[model samples]
Target: AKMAFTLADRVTEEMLADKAALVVEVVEENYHDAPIVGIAVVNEHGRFFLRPETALADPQFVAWLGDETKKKSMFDSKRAAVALKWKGIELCGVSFDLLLAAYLLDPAQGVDDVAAAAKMKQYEAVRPDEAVYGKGAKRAVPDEPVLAEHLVRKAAAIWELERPFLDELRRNEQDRLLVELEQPLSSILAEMEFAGVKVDTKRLEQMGKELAEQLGTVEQRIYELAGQEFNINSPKQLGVILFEKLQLPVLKKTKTGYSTSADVLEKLAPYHEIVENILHYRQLGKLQSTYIEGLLKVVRPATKKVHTIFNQALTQTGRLSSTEPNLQNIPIRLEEGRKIRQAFVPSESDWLIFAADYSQIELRVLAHIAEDDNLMEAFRRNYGGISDYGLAQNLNISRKEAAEFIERYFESFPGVKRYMENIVQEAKQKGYVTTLLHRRRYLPDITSRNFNVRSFAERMAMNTPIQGSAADIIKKAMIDLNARLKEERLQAHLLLQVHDELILEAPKEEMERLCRLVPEVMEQAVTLRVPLKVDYHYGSTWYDAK
Candidate 1:
């Protein structure tokens, strides 16, 4: 729940020798003159790590009187960080997350006990958190006699996880990833979430109204075309109109009723005008109800911003997801979908939105990790120009030819196929796939007897590292950007982080500098064996920026 403490600035041989549980306390300034409630610590050997009897003196001293816990758990997980405001030392390069690490370790592994992880490596320092803190909302903390022991045991268990995982990071050859990359990124993520972006409630309501009007127009048109009136949203209604009334083919069925999903209707679009009209209606209806109306409710009265929570630990892979007006799910690529962004104006009138993103990061990551010659050659040449179709002109072939060309291209890049095969095999053998930076995804179903189950497991194995590493890269870029901006006293700061993309707000005067700087910082975030590329745009509004 707290992000304040994590691993060391870096690992050193001398510090590794003590095997003492670590302790760090923030100074008064960081905590806003609050009491130091508690501190979770690990020994030099990671022997002791867990919760104390209560919160720390640094403002998290709880009371349901929480604004501190409700407040951001300020974070700095980087190795050798010079703690600002209040001079302090960071954790050992061990790990910054237990809840996330346990989740990443796999649900099949049993998330309830920290001791189970200890037993896997023959360590006795393990205990269940439930044993210490009773269940339910009224659950007690280390309020019992074992409170002190409970804290140390938890610390020890965490240490055991860190050292072993650290060792594995080395064996898996991603040793530098956890402490070097992921740890550093955590701090910036916290900052970004805490520094939430503004939302335009006026524009949001206006857009919702426009969407409603358009939806009404489309519905009337659909009714005219269908020669009947019915609920367009209801599959049963659409089903009766299209199938019974119009006598179109029934492409599929469900236990409840006819399937009128977008995909199924897309296939029927050619058969009827009402079908396409229904799709547009559904899309607009969702935009108005969810994106517009839903978003407006969440805006803060004081700030006029929709302060969404960023889930750094929720994904098995390292990618981030958002909630409470999920910025990620806000539609893009469709005119109807993008109306939501118009409400995402810059925080200040003089500021502009600056969006930058990797052009094709996952494909680039795949090429680098797979060490595929054809893929690498294509990327090196900026093949196709950023799409598989971009490879078309580069290879002097038609798009149709490009399809088979990609197939043969994989034939040339034999390593890509082989690497995918190896990922599944590794999951089969080890029950997990480790990313380039030691982020892991465990797939117990890799050996599933069912075709679908096995296929999904294989996809997880192949997808985790490619996707997670890309996340790792951008996360680090965010950290770098934050640092650069703060150090240079730049007017711009990060606003939103969609997958493979960063949305920042900067002064109108600083726009040109940020456009040049953001891509440079992002592309240079990591040293992928394959080159990384970034693109940028900016405008008065999010849509205008794009």
Candidate 2:
């Protein structure tokens, strides 16, 4: 359907005999080179008129084209011409630039195809295909002219609505970052989607079966301890069994009955074996339902891998969240939860998984930011014998007497006391704490009318510096690790990040190298007053990594 015509190329008058329609010429020019032009003529019926002698005179036509009055009409012409034009002002105009800008601004807002865009906007806004074809994609168009008119008008309307936003976006560079960063980040996400992490399906299935069996045993023991059979999952049923049948005191009440939440039951566990059994049952149930069953469902057949989606935009503090298998929330503190990591293993033979995590990163960052000399020195000295300072000042005791005093200090300052106090006070006043890299998080509600809201803000103010700082360190490490891998031509791929822990898939042969290189990169990614330590382990499955 494509035909090329050159200025020196010839044609016969017979080429024009069958044509009958409107004709237009489009000329494109570049200032650095000779100008290029094209010409075409249309008959009354709107078909192109093509012939050898039908050519418009080059010199006279070019002169007319240069005239401002004729230039507009010539560009819009249903006739023929030849002209040398200003490239920017004529060929590569503002309209074309605007279209590119609009695409860059919000590519998702537009239609997937011509038919969708050509559809009427107002009435058929929700049913685009129906308005254009009088039905949908299955419908056929009877008249090309009507369709052409509709498409042109619709395209113009879309462009009009989009133009102002593009102009405003072009003006604000900060506003444009939402699109610029997101677009490239989305491309990285797509790569993650394709290169998913491998899952040990057999191991996961076995773990689920074992957990289920344990749950059954615990349920039977709970029934024996209560001296009656009842639904353990139901709080109402369990509440009656505990409070009424077993005659235990109700600690709290819910809408239906006495509350049987784990927190309340945890306190009761020491008093009664029944309460202890109930705790066992609840813990096992969580293991079965959330970890074992939930993970089993997401394991992909093709890669035998779990592809966790990291939501970069969701968290207010700029921390990433995971879903469709949240690897971050996996329990690593308990033996059973630690076993879940064993389900993740390397895909290739002789490859091992390497995990490098920052050691007390937040505390160190807080020390540096707060400029607490004692805390900074404590970290620099590797958190050893730090109780001596605490004992001497707070307990008013000698260094020898500081052991019990230091233990008492840890027991008293269980939730990062000094770090919390400093960060909360600063954040309450200034609204944010910038990282070493100048990343900011604004908390407007830190100064609120309500006590609850203000208290929550204070908590957030304390939490963000530590949590957000850790997130920053991990992000920098990931970026640097990727660069190192590329430079060294290593086959390691970063597959997942679970809160403080980063998981990778590497060949078994590369285990020792990775163990050394990863911790080295992570430790060096950022410097802090405190020494950063990493723990490493390996197993046949992710759950086996300890």
Candidate 3:
């Protein structure tokens, strides 16, 4: 309780080291959890107070941190009630996430963690964490003195980084986007994580056993068909059997051996009956390993829930990611993945799991950025504005017909395809492109001589803004919805945010109300040249909601 990483011990270190401040590293930098930075107060004395970034145990007190006077301070996370009355602090004070700013201003700055950022800036006042705490299997907590100096030194960097970054934000005029929009959204996301989704452990266990038996049967079938059995789970072994023993043509190969990837197997489907069985085994194995076992392991025994930590400042295009069981990446394309989601139930009986996801959000963003008429026209809610992959089934048309349909009222695909060229053209000329919020991911490869390098940069240039802006809109909607929910004292609460989707659990009574409210809030969250749309539905479990 008494001894930990500094700040508590040295609040007035501000007086000792003018640049002394609190510092933190996010999961992006290999820390287990650090979702937001984007939190901390840097005293004028150079002492920077630290806060939990990834693991936001308490979402409300995220702001106000550090001491009362020269002598006393408490790291009270529940500041709204517990600490607010104790100290009477107002806000966390003006803050910026150096890691996030570094990426926005210049991608070459190497903003992996606080230490790495300091290294990129060549302000090596503090030792890097790897050297302080040994990395890899040898990683261990260092001596107190070493830990103290390491944290203190990072605070100093925070002190240095703050002014330069703020200036850059002003110069880039992205100050509002960072401090105003995205920064506030970080707290909302933290709250969502803390208010975790309820999981039905009984259903999960049942599914796991079924998956195991079904996969076992598939493995046996594969062995029978292949006339042998040797670590079907081993990619190398599978590669050897397919290419070496069966004399199947080598589709592709990696450093170790042949590529038995689904893409390769899908191509080789008609080639052999054994190939189909192998593909089935692989798909089943992945569901068993990834979803079945993984979800089972992560579900908290105490609460029968899963609290997925979402990284606020990690992705290049502002996309959110999660870990400690990444719900963000459940491979929802497969029906098995949907079945796994059936395990995620609700806190209350008869209440529903409702999901609202923007309809072709990225493509609509693309239409706005490119100012493409065709895309904008498609977005106009003619036949509901859902893109090909989204509407092909709903509209009862062939997949080929779906492509042609987009060229009609749903020209979202072709229109966005043309928009890709518009930005790629500018990226080639200007050596970079920018987002709607003006957050720039530098494209050094734009001018690179290599063809693949140039092509990669072009995709980045075209994709970043479209995808990142969609991220922006969802974040915007989250802030508004979170605030509105509290302001109205609603029982519905945000639980999960996966890509363009938002999952909420509420009493069945609110379902009809939310069905109207969700889309209205989301579509109006921002004003693009074209309109944004959200598709939503509710059911007892996440599977039915989808």
Candidate 4:
């Protein structure tokens, strides 16, 4: 029995040695192998363990596990140690590295979570099980041995499939940048999440009640306007009241019944006063339902701060999305919507909220990419404000006409024009674009055969250079600002980011410093033809920033 056990230990050590050797070869070749070092420590008794013999021999491997765990542990009696560590291990670090590689291979795939990553790799599906024993642990391994075995095998297969590509990605310079930046950026993002925006419960509740009362009044008026009473919320009933009973024109139809969408109602506003009133009523109803009432429900009891989760993977264009009280889509255009900002207030007295956003960042990126002298000159002179050289040279118009022409040019080519168009064309041919910070997004199918696929590719080609550039800029700004904030040891905290906008909570005295610094970092984060712009306001609530 001793001899057999000794042989088994030898074999296991050999297997671990082989895996370590493979990793060494990869590192020597400058191949990343996803920078993960897997350590398998087995104990037949308690003394014998297998790791790379020399610490300095495999620096990458050593860095992952650390030298402290080199000795056998008291817990190692007949135990197995399976340690998996990436070079930079953090939430965003892992996510960003995994996502960037996924993008390189399949840019169209949404690179969000572990599940999405697994799906993109086309791994065999594994169903999640409910945990029976642990707190907040809702998942358990499958009971059936065969099912579990199959799942394990599938997981092994996925790891094997990803291994080679991960190695290649590590060697790629672009992938290195992703690894280097991901962890630091994630740390900054964590701070932002921790520093949630202030919310005034009383004001929000009052607004909710006020909007509710107004909606009720409007609802009553709508019944009178239609000469009948019906379910205002029901599309079917509203359709009949507007089209059949009221004899309004049928602009469009939908699966439910008639199209009573806000857009349709908006178009019909010019036709009748009742339509306008209905539009106003519907708008108010949405505000009450989504913001006033919806926001009130999400207010955290302990902090009263709204910590919205920013989803970097939701949008195909790489734009950020938010949820769990989507502060991004907060009503800002209407007076009622704008008033909702009052609910967000500073945590302490004398503290203020600071908000900043990039001014025409996408357009500036477009100008830089296109290298259009006219556009570049416009940006150089602060969008033709300084000298109007672009207008004078490109359009051959007066300084006033230059500005007018530039505005008209943007309007005419609303979807793809100027620098944006140039980027699309270039990316379609080259498959990638380097942002100011050299972050690259590769579009593999810019030359697809299918029209729909090709169209999407073309749109991405046009969009990513601008959008990705903006993302790169903001990410850098976040990192820089977090560092600056820490260095200064200020009380201001970054709360949330929704695309181009950044939200910060600070003392009222710090508002001026933030206003100046935030825009400065964002503007200088990347150089472009058009100057970056920012707008800000402050109040006792998040909505007051408008």
Candidate 5:
């Protein structure tokens, strides 16, 4: 009952020669330093080698690592990136990823654990990692016998699941989406995460001081206007003061009390002077708490860098999100909030922050997807906007005038109108909507009997393709930009991705070339009925770069 397995000190030449698929499992002692305890290597032949030491630096293993002909596969290639790259080795030839494959196949059922994903794929031999290694106080790396079997089986699961996942991806016509877009972008994200953005701690500290003063001023004004001081942070207290004491028109009421939410406060802005002060106070408080204090909490003391975790698989709209400081939510509209961007400085001397963002990407995506000639012409001429009350308020026009403008816009861009109607109807019939990249978002509510449910789904059906395609385009732009940077052997590093924008840090010498290169690469990320546009700026910090 012997398995084709053995303890190995180093990868042998025979291991690489016959192996069509090489799957790796890096066993880490702790997530802190991500110190690799050992590694499990499984070949296509089910031949397993358990390296019970940090053998990532093993010359034999490194030789076959990125060899394109010697195909490599793994679960969570992002984590494997740290293992390989920590040893100063590049991760490549990753032809399959169990995590990404499972994510792409059924994103709602996103991959969480290796054993869970393996079981989902109908490969049941592998057990949960926690079972072998317990949690918290009980957690410990087992003996070699147990550890070897555990990791080997994990690798074995990856080895077994690869073909079926690939087949499923092919069946769903998302193979290219994986092979071309997501897989390539995965490594780039790894690079970005590793090369975390530098922050000017002093600038953030100065901003925090200023925010404290501003917040206090706003709070005092709110108290003066309300005729009595109350807990500004407490919604219940504010609600009573606004609706009951001040006798302001109540916009909404909750089960326990009157609603004093942002939307309510915004509408009540016209009703009373105190409402504006309250709104200002709330904004300042969030700026102080979320951005100022929150950012400082995560900045690495030694490097002054904030390494955010990019969740590539989380968003249902196929967009990337980040946490551990939530860099994406750094507000742009408020001068005080935008000042937070000033703290994001270039990592190196003589280097500058560069920002290149798609101009009106979602609208342009809508133009192309909807095939609206007028909308396409508007982009070809370079302009964008959006709704009747929405358009009226945006342009500060009368509702009647806005209503008329909408009719004229529909008349001018009938294709867009038709596209909107047909998309909802099609989504109702087909049960899902798809982006240009064929990334689908299921809209089961489109056919719901409930008016609100069906209406919401219809809106999603109309919007998701445009939004999702814009996301795909930006992602492709990142992948393309990474390759171009490599091809030129540039020192510039892609640091952060904020929705439609890409932020980079480059030496002053490369600024001229990057200014031209970034925009060109982004605009050409995807071909469309209308031309895509990119705007770029660079300066000492991200604030000025914008």
Candidate 6:
């Protein structure tokens, strides 16, 4: 019971040769190169800590971890793998991942909570990260003895959780979900982050200038209408101008100021020209701040690329979300916001940006699951954008006519209507709904007595299977496409995955093969009653790929 934590000055092949497997925990300062500060390895033989800041780690030990020929088990290896890749290592043989498995077993439990996960498994030996190092701005590493003990416990906790997590995933029949799809996907995403999408900073800067000039013109117009100048950014000042001075009727007011929010401003647009200018001003300002300035901040000076961390375990629907300048949030509808893509160019000369996207992926999933002839025929005929008279206002049609349209739609697609009605009932009974790949989303509120709560749950019940299945398909496509790329030895490589679209870059020679392979892999990702369709494009910049 009294196993001492061995603080090894160096690791040798002979030391690791007798051990069955090794578990690792890496301490890092940054996401990029020179990232690893310290590392701890634990096995049945003993626990070891290799402190790098004390001095450089042994080169042979570092080389062993990166060697692809040497199989090893690593927990939560995505970020650490990327860091390893930065130092010319391809960290491999990741048989299990606590984060990915936890996400699949019960996403609401949350991922990245190592201590919490350990507790759930009834192992209370591990301490929360904040407990030892504090959190955020207050974080500080403890002395060597404390740090080493903390790392050993973390490695042990991970090692202990591996068996239970894997068993639970198997219990829930999510072995393939973790093993085939997500584990491979994690490695693929690591490579994508390491080889980040290139950006033309000059283009971004020039666009910044143009946006600033436009903002100034819009600002002046608003001031002219107000008959005086004030800080446009100040919601209070803008509210006073619109509601008090300009004499526009106030829709709502807050404790500190008027409700100058987007909903209120959009309503006021018809009342005064100044409201339009204000809305335009806010749009440009947001584009300038969030997209331009924010993006520029994250772009590495040396590489001229933005390395976004893909949050694999974050979303309940199994879709990946990105952070540190969220490439996912860039607005596609607005012209100015759309122009942000123009700056994303190929890293290499003679290479072109290629984009491929699924057509109505979620709707197609709905067609497949609901077994609706009309819906499937719509896809067969290549018709897109399914909606209802909740769309009446959007269609600008009479409510009676919208009702008639809905009636006709259901009449034309009885299977879809049947599915809509039955899915909610099934969810109420089972307390959960599942995707095509058996990914579960529990709908606890499906049986709620409250109408709004139950309605929301019902909507989710109908929506989750379609959306989640679509997400699963695309992820599978990425895994398969990555394999194909490796198999064919194509120079083309995937860069960004924006929901339904996958963006890649390839030389002119590889374009034809890429264009052919991408769609084939995506369409064949899943076999549904309704066929999945893909659209492909390529150009000098990401914008042109559209």
lDDT of 2 at 314: 48
Computed on alpha carbons, the lDDT of every model, listed in order, comes to 0.66, 0.56, 0.67, 0.56, 0.80, 0.80
Candidate 4 residues 124-192, lDDT tens each? 343221121122444232333333233233233333435544565665555554445543564465445
lDDT of 6 by residue, 431-530 (tens): 8888999898877778889988988888888888888898899999999999999899999988989888898999978888988999999999999998
The TM-score measured for candidate 5 stands at: 0.88
For model 2, residues 1-546, the per-residue Cα lDDT tens digits are 122222223333322332221122221211111232223322222222222133333333333333433212111111121112212122111112222233233333343332333232222322233465554445554353444344333333333433354455556442343333332333343344445678788888999888888888888888888888889988888888888887887777878779898767875765678998887788788878888899888877766877665655445554667777887788777786678777777787777767666677767776766666666677777233244654454444576777766666555544455655767778877766544543456667888999888877777676666666776677667667767877888887777766566777777777777888888887887777666666666555666555
Which stretches in model 4 have alpha-carbon errors above 4 Å? 1-107, 111-173, 253-257, 382-457
Please give the range of 10 consecutive residues that has the lowest summed lDDT in model 6: 382-391
Q: Identify the runs in model 2 with alpha carbons over 4 angstroms from their true place.
A: 1-190, 252-257, 382-433
**Residue 206 in model 2: lDDT:** 93
> If ranked by TM-score, best first, what sequence of candidates would result?
6, 5, 3, 1, 4, 2
What local lDDT does model 6 show for residue 106?
75
RMSD of each: 8.7, 16.1, 7.0, 10.9, 3.6, 3.0
Candidate 2 lDDT? 0.56
In candidate 6 the C-alpha lDDT for residue 216 amounts to 92
Q: Give each model a TM-score.
A: 0.72, 0.61, 0.80, 0.69, 0.88, 0.91
Top-down lDDT ranking: 6, 5, 3, 1, 4, 2
Worst 10 residues of 3 by lDDT: 72-81
